Structures are given as structure tokens and as C-alpha cells.
């Protein structure tokens, strides 16, 4: 489906250090490619994917300066939130922001988003028109009025329809051989005689990209989801992902069951059995 570029900012206050820490990571689809961490004497934006590293000095300088500016804006945001909620200066709090753009079939913005959370609760979000805000709570209603007076949503709209889409297009080209290639899962079924009267069959999908996958078990074509254990999809460590789904079947009845693997990298969905 549609490709996207997104960033994820996490700011935490640190009353004991008298400061705040600001971390920002960027992703194209399911692939991280940049980071910034404010907790260094001379912090710089840094590459976290091999294909971004060819960017010139001017790319790195711009991103580093945005990050330094963000670290200050989020330091102030943490103090303003503490004030809105009349919270103690004793405690650490967390403010997160995520925003990004999805690319449409004509190479223009399909959908842009931009939103925040404080201590994990929704705070404020940019609307569909990209020119206005929806507040989740009362403090964010005061933020909303200040931001309408600022008018900065016009410049965020400009970014999401412009630079966000234009840079995503560039990253897709630079990393095309991984970012625009669906890597199919390598699969197998294992068997673990478990119980006096049960055998565990586990259906694995290893090394797949992107993250979206469907693993299901059937008994003679009938879905077994209510009885299967399905683990959360997890990174392989090389930029791909893994997942498994297991279920206990009666002894001697392995031939009655199939695992169905559906992933965009496959030529065809797989039907696997313990053979």
C-alpha cells in the first residue's frame, strides 16, 4: 500500500538534571533511517540506514539544526504542560509527537497527519484539512487557541504537502532496492509433542518485509484463531521481521491442519502442513 515518511519525537523532563531529553527518529514505511538524541555535548542528526548515508553535509546540517531547535521547543512544552495540569516539579513527564505523509498514486500527498500525547494520553491533532486542530482535553483547548493565533498550521500544511512528500520520494529512490521490494517470508512448521494428549504445531514466517502479514491455522479449512497463540510481529535485526502462530492438536491428527501464510512478497499465499 501507500508509502509513508514519519517521524516520532519523544521528550522527557528530567527534574534531577535540571533539563529535558529529546529523541527523534525517522522512518520510511517500516524502516528506521535517522535519529537524534539531545543527551550529548555536541548532538548531530545521524544516519540509521545504509542508504541515507550518501546525503551531503547540507542535509545533515539542516536536520541537526531542526533537532536542536526542537529540543528547545519541547523543553518549553514540558514546562507549559506541567503548568496546565498544575503538576509537581518533582516528577518526570513525557510528551510525544508523531507526524508524517503518505504518498498517493499521482505522487502527491494522499494523507498527512500530525499529533501529540502527554504521559501517553492523546493531547492534540491536526485535522484532515491540515489547517486546523482538534483538542482531546482542556489544556489542549488552550493550546489550540494559541496555535490558531500563531497560524503555524498553514506552514505544517505546506510541509506535509511539499517537503514531506518530496523527501519521501527521494528516500524511496535512494533505498529502492529494499524500500520498494517486498521480501517474502521464509517459512516452516515445527512440531513439539507437548502433552500426553497434545502436539504443538508452530508455523513460522522469518525475514519478511514489510511488516504486514497474515498467519492463520485451519482444521480442514475451518479457521482456528480462537485457539491459536499468535506472537506480536518482531524485528529480525536486519531490517526484516518475524512472526509465528502455534496451536495444540490431538495426537495423530496433524494431517487435519494447515497454516496459511499471506504476505505481499509471495508469488502466491502458502498453505503449509506438518508433513
Amino acid at each position: 500500500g501507500p508509502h509513508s515518511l514519519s517521524y516520532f519525537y519523544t521528550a522527557v523532563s528530567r527534574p534531577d538534571r535540571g533539563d529535558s531529553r529529546f529523541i527523534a527518529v525517522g522512518y520510511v514505511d517500516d524502516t528506521q533511517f535517522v535519529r537524534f538524541d539531545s543527551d550529548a555535548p555536541n548532538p548531530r542528526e545521524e544516519p540509521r540506514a545504509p542508504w541515507i548515508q550518501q546525503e551531503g553535509q547540507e542535509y545533515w546540517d539542516r536536520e541537526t539544526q531542526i533537532s536542536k531547535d526542537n529540543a528547545q521547543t519541547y523543553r518549553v512544552n514540558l514546562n507549559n504542560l506541567r503548568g496546565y495540569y498544575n503538576q509537581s516539579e518533582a516528577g518526570s513527564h513525557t510528551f510525544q509527537n508523531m507526524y508524517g505523509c503518505y504518498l498517493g498514486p499521482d505522487g502527491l500527498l494522499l494523507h498527512g497527519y500530525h499529533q501529540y500525547a502527554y504521559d501517553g494520553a492523546d493531547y492534540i491533532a491536526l485535522n484532515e484539512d491540515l489547517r486546523s486542530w482538534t483538542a482531546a482535553d482542556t489544556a489542549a483547548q488552550i493550546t489550540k487557541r494559541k496555535w490558531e493565533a500563531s497560524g503555524w498550521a498553514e506552514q505544517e500544511r505546506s510541509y506535509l504537502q511539499g517537503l514531506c512528500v518530496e523527501s519521501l520520494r527521494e528516500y524511496l529512490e535512494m533505498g529502492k532496492d529494499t524500500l520498494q521490494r517486498a521480501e517474502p517470508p521464509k517459512t516452516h512448521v515445527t512440531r513439539h509433542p507437548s502433552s500426553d494428549l497434545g502436539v504443538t504445531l508452530r508455523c513460522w514466517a522469518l525475514g519478511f518485509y514489510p511488516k504486514e502479514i497474515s498467519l492463520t491455522w485451519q482444521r480442514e479449512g475451518q479457521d482456528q484463531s480462537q485457539d491459536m497463540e499468535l506472537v506480536e510481529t518482531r524485528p529480525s535485526g536486519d531490517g526484516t521481521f518475524q512472526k509465528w502462530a502455534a496451536l495444540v492438536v490431538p495426537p495423530g491428527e496433524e494431517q487435519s491442519y494447515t497454516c496459511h501464510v499471506q504476505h505481499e512478497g509471495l508469488q502466491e499465499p502458502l498453505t503449509l502442513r506438518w508433513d
Partner: peptide
Amino acid sequence: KMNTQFTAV
């Protein structure tokens, strides 16, 4: 490439 954010909450 990142957006520019200067407007505190």
C-alpha cells in the same frame, strides 16, 4: 526531512 516546530503548547 523533518518539519520545523517552534510554537510551544
